Amino acid sequence: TQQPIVTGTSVISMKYDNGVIIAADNLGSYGSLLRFNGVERLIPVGDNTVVGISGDISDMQHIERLLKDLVTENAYDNPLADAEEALEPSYIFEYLATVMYQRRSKMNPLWNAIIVAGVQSNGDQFLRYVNLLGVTYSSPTLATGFGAHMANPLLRKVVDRESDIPKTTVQVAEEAIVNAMRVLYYRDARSSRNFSLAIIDKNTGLTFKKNLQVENMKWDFAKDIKGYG
């Protein structure tokens, strides 16, 4: 049974009408020591899916090597497998879902919480969750670790349910996720000012935005106080 050594923080996710925005921090803590910076935690898989991985960096690598090898496997045989038999976020999820159970039944799990986000090639959003317990669920807003209780209420204002999805567009989605990173920088011990953010859209395709910096700082309430004891 594997015990956490090097770990990441959290992933935050929402849906809008034509895509998903998955974004996650970049940290590699070993306990309190922020050991590693620049641990890139979004990994593109195929061309219409970004898989965000939190939990162990130990286990992140193994999963990285697996999903790269997923595209290698898909690409063996088939003269068309990029518009006819490509990977879609439904496929990618179910692979990892099956290993997580398998390793749990060996009593030796792969310690990660993973969120698989993407657009299908039928034009239907897929954002579904898996973790080390093997627990799986889908919800219009997903978030992991600290960010599950912490940074998910904001996003749940924007998209609460299925019926609020055609009325949220890309710009609104984008402001929510950045707005959520500001809470996580402030008010979670494990956090990073850098964070990687990928916009998956069905109509524009894959867009990667690298090292977006937390902003709209407030701190002018720390000069208000003088503290007390």
Binding site: D77, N78, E85, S90, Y91, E94, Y95, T98
Partner: peptide, 15 residues
Amino acid sequence: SLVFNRKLAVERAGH
């Protein structure tokens, strides 16, 4: 169906 939730492709079947 169990591992990828995916219909088997005829061409991959054949090989």
